[PDB]
Amino acid sequence: VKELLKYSNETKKRNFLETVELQVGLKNYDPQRDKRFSGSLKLPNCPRPNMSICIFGDAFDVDRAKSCGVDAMSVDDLKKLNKNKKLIKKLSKKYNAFIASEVLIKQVPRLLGPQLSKAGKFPTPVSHNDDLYGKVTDVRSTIKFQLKKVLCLAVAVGNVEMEEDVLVNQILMSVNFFVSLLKKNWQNVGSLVVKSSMGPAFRL
Amino acid sequence: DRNTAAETFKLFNKYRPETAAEKKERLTKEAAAVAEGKSKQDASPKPYAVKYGLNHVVALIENKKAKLVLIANDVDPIELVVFLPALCKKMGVPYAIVKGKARLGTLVNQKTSAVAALTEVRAEDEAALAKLVSTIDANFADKYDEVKKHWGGGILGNKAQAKMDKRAKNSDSA
Amino acid sequence: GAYKYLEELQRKKQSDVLRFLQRVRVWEYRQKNVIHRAARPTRPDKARRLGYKAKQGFVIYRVRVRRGNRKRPVPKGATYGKPTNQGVNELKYQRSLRATAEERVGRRAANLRVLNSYWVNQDSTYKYFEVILVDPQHKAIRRDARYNWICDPVHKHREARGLTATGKKSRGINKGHKFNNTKAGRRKTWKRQNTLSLWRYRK
RNA sequence: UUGACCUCAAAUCAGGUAGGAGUACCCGCUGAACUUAAGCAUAUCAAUAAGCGGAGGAAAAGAAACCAACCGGGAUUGCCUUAGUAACGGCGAGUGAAGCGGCAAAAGCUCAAAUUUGAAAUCUGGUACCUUCGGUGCCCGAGUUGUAAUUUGGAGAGGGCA
RNA sequence: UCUUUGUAAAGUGCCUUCGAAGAGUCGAGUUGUUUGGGAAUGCAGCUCUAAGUGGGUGGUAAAUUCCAUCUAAAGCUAAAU
RNA sequence: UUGACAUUGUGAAGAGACAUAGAGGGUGUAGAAUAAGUGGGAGCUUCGGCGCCAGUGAAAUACCACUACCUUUAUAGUUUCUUUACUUAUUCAAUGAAGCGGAGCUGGAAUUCAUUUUCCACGUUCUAGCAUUCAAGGUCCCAUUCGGGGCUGAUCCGGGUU
Structure with a gap:
């Protein structure tokens, strides 16, 4: 049971001495392959926010560069091109659309590396900018499968009480388990080494 | 050892089961009592004999009611008795491995007995019972994991042992 | 009781305890005679559930049968017939070795009657059984109607006509x-x- | 040094008991070949004859680790039938069952595995007596490495109530 | 017809705790044999060796998922023949 | 005749990897800087110091961790190869299972580098005689009868016949 240990709860709140927003990280454990189409390639909505700071480089076009002046972080265009290829790195993740698919071949050498752009896996080029902005400023998780076997993500914050963080670790267990390929083994919940950023590790 | 077995067999000389003549005596007494006072086996006193019999003693250990259990160091169908140290360790009952099942027979008036068990005791020797429990748990129950991990056997005959001693003395040292 | 515990010990036969006991007993029987008296069972759990009551008349014998295939007689392999029926080495003898053990102890102690038998041991060269013969003329067996059915003379030599387990x-x-x-x-x-x-x- | 226990023994020890014959049927093992295939090698004769072991007035089987697939049936044996079918087979020669349906007969159960533990209560033998195919008493022995009562898969055990 | 053997035994309603049930065996590989039994009907040798809402069987092998019916590895029993 | 499995176990070498953590190792550009990769992340420690930021590259760190990558096994076993060292299995052989193993004693080779560090012997050779009475002697007893007992003569220890 996840109730005797902390795993999202009140029990690990004074173990870390930093009084800053320190977030919890859950690792799923199951042997997989080395190929790239296997694994759980999906990033759902995280219901309670991760409480992270992120600014969006919305390089939009005619029909979509108007809904950024109400509920967004930064308002950009496609004309500002000589900045995001050479020098500036003041961003966490961007957000684009399908209307401009010819500007994507330009911002490859600087933003594809540290996860500031999109290749094929995360829902970054989503067209709707009037409803999906109540889901990305409330920072989601990050489901990204690595080479052999580790799955490092982020659920919530340790200083947040166990009332908001009670259906967040449970909805996240139902994403890396059911949409997964039939290339995984038995007991997809075998080991869950869960440590936030500073304290000890609490496992199931 | 000889001393703890001496104290244990003093305590069991105090506690022997009823023989045939004593049974005939209590049969005459309760035959008078039921015919006259109509006491339903209650004019007789409550017994305090040793418990014995292997299914008897194993069932008493399973039901957590045995105070002390003596175990023999014997019969070659040892499948009878190798699970008694593990039962007595699992169920916390102290257990001692007394030498020879024949002394167990003489304290119970049989030829052999192969087990012995106290569940009751009169109030005379509670302290002696606790002292024997302490001594036996110093000898057996606390030392269970140590003897559990070690392999006995491998002792050679003295001729080949002396030959090995000469060879290991003259091939390694001078 | 404790026969559940002996039963579950006797099921695990290749753990270190039973292979030790099996090696001591296989030597112990390979140094005695072929058919010899067993004063007491070595498997009371198995003996009692076949019909052993430890009282007078029930005798336990222990018996070594040789172990392998029935090499056919009709000497030097010349079987004198069709080449279908020409095997000598690979013929395999419809009776069990458990039947030869019971039948040989029934031919030795012939005043007694056989109830069952059970395995105790096997090496490469032999199988070792214990046979649980009943003495029918003994008066403890003739009374107590659970055990007088061996007294009826249609049960002479249950081991020869194939009547045991x-x-x-x-x-x-x-x-x-x-x-x-x-x-x-x-x-x-x-x-x-x-x-x-x-x-x-x-x- | 005395006294037990286990194990193995020795007696023209006390008392028992098996061997053999017959073998028509019955239960097992073992086990051919002539013969048919128009030759003959697998096959068939045949899971037979000869040999062997063991019983009884019957033996064996027998109360389902069964048949079924239905609306389910219900120990075993035997007969009428399924059936000269399904299947096997140099798919040649030949070999060859079962379930249901009808009938005769119909009969059901017993042990191990639960401490009786305010009580081995059980049993063989020897003795003395008798209403002496047995009963009672007493006495050594077997026996708790377990003898009796209680229950056996269909039920049943332990408490509680009327 | 002489004992009345017995404050003994048996039987059934309701609730609860229970509910033990047979391993060199079951089974499988291969070989010999037999069968009508055909990726194997049974027995037997040897090699491996179990399980507990388990195990067998449901006659074309195997994997996966249900269903059905049964309880082995212990023993007694007249009549129909 | 050969190979595989069983009877058939146990010690001593050599490679594959796990229970169990740790020191450390792992240098193509750029970037305070050896970032095998990832996650959290703007701050922690009394302070210092680093870190956010800046800049860089495919990868941004202070701080806590997971997978991994090359050694180190210190603790306990599993494997095929080495044949070595085993007695208890197994197999042979002999004797009316007679002296086996270990130790000591006297001599003596032996040289002492402190005192013996070692090793051998430890009742018979001119002769076709003889060898037996629990053994004479020495020593302790009995209650002295005629006799008998005990130790030694013939070293102890272990019960594995060799």
Whole structure:
């Protein structure tokens, strides 16, 4: 049971001495392959926010560069091109659309590396900018499968009480388990080494 | 050892089961009592004999009611008795491995007995019972994991042992 | 009781305790005679559930049978016939070795009657059994109606005619569609269907 | 040094008991070949004859680790039938069952595995007596490495109530 | 017809705790044999060796998922023949 | 005749990897800087110091961790190869299972580098005689009868016949 240990709860709140927003990280454990189409390639909505700071480089076009002046972080265009290829790195993740698919071949050498752009896996080029902005400023998780076997993500914050963080670790267990390929083994919940950023590790 | 077995067999000389003549005596007494006072086996006193019999003693250990259990160091169908140290360790009952099942027979008036068990005791020797429990748990129950991990056997005959001693003395040292 | 515990010990036969005991006992029996008296069972859990009551008349014998294939006689392999029936080495003898053990102790102690038998041991060269013979003329067996059925003289030599637990096996007797060579014995159901049954008024 | 226990023994020890004959049927093992295939090697004769072991007035089987697939049936044996079918087979020669349906007969159960533990209560033998195919008493022995009562898969055990 | 053997035994309603049930066996590989039994009907040798809402069987092998019916590895029993 | 499995176990070498953590190792550009990769992340420690930021590259760190990558096994076993060292299995052989193993004693080779560090012997050779009475002697007893007992003569220890 996840109730005797902390795993999202009140029990690990004074173990870390930093009084800053320190977030919890859950690792799923199951042997997989080395190929790239296997694994759980999906990033759902995280219901309670991760409480992270992120600014969006919305390089939009005619029909979509108007809904950024109400509920967004930064308002950009496609004309500002000589900045995001050479020098500036003041961003966490961007957000684009399908209307401009010819500007994507330009911002490859600087933003594809540290996860500031999109290749094929995360829902970054989503067209709707009037409803999906109540889901990305409330920072989601990050489901990204690595080479052999580790799955490092982020659920919530340790200083947040166990009332908001009670259906967040449970909805996240139902994403890396059911949409997964039939290339995984038995007991997809075998080991869950869960440590936030500073304290000890609490496992199931 | 000889001393703890001496104290244990003093305590069991105090506690022997009823023989045939004593049974005939209590049969005459309760035959008078039921015919006259109509006491339903209650004019007789409550017994305090040793418990014995292997299914008897194993069932008493399973039901957590045995105070002390003596175990023999014997019969070659040892499948009878190798699970008694593990039962007595699992169920916390102290257990001692007394030498020879024949002394167990003489304290119970049989030829052999192969087990012995106290569940009751009169109030005379509670302290002696606790002292024997302490001594036996110093000898057996606390030392269970140590003897559990070690392999006995491998002792050679003295001729080949002396030959090995000469060879290991003259091939390694001078 | 404790026969559940002996039962579960006797099931695990290749752990270090039972292979030690099996090696001591295999030496212990390989230095005694071929058929010799066992004063007490070595498997009271198995002996008691076959019908052992430890009282007077029940005797336990212990018996070494040789272990392998029945090499056919008719000497030097010349079998004098069709080359179908020409095997000598690979013929494999419809009776069990458990039946030869019971039958040999029934030929030795012939005043007694055999109840069952059980395995105790096997090495490469031999199988070792204990046989649980009953003495029928002993007055403890003749009374107490659970055990007087061995007194009835239709049970002379249960071990020879195939009547024990293993004789009723080696004869192929059960119920079932799989047992149609023999369900009621083989030869009766042979002769019952190679009979050309006729009647008075020919149908 | 005395006294037990286990194990193995020795007696023209006390008392028992098996061997053999017959073998028509019955239970097992073992086990051919002539013969048929128009030759003959698998096959068939045949899971037979000869040999062997063991019983009884019957033996064996027998209360389902069964048949079924239905609306389910219900120990075993035997007869009428299924059936000269399904299947096997140099798919040649030949070999060859079962379930249901009808009938005769119909009969059911017993042990191991639960400490009786306010009580081995059980049993063989020897003795003395008798209403002496046995009963009672007493006495050594077997026996708790377990003898009796209680229950056996269909039920049943332990408490509680009327 | 002489004992009345017995404050003994048996039987059934309701609730609860329970509910033990047979391993060199079951089974499988291969070989010999037999069968009508055909990727194997049964027995037997040897090699491996179990399980507990388990195990057998449901006659074309195997994997996966249900269903059905049964309880083995211990023993007694007249009549129909 | 050969190979595989069983009877058939146990010690001593050599490679594959796990229970169990740790020191450390792992240098193509750029970037305070050897970032095998990832996650959290703007701050922690009394302070210092680093870190956010800046800049860089495919990868941004202070701080806590997971997978991994090359050694180190210190603790306990599993494997095929080495044949070595085993007695208890197994196999042979002999004797009316007679002296086996270890130790000591006297001599003596032996040289002492402190005192013996070692090793051998430890009742018979001119002769076709003889060898037996629990053994004479020495020593302790009995209650002195005629006799008998005990130790030694013939070293102890272990019960594995060799």
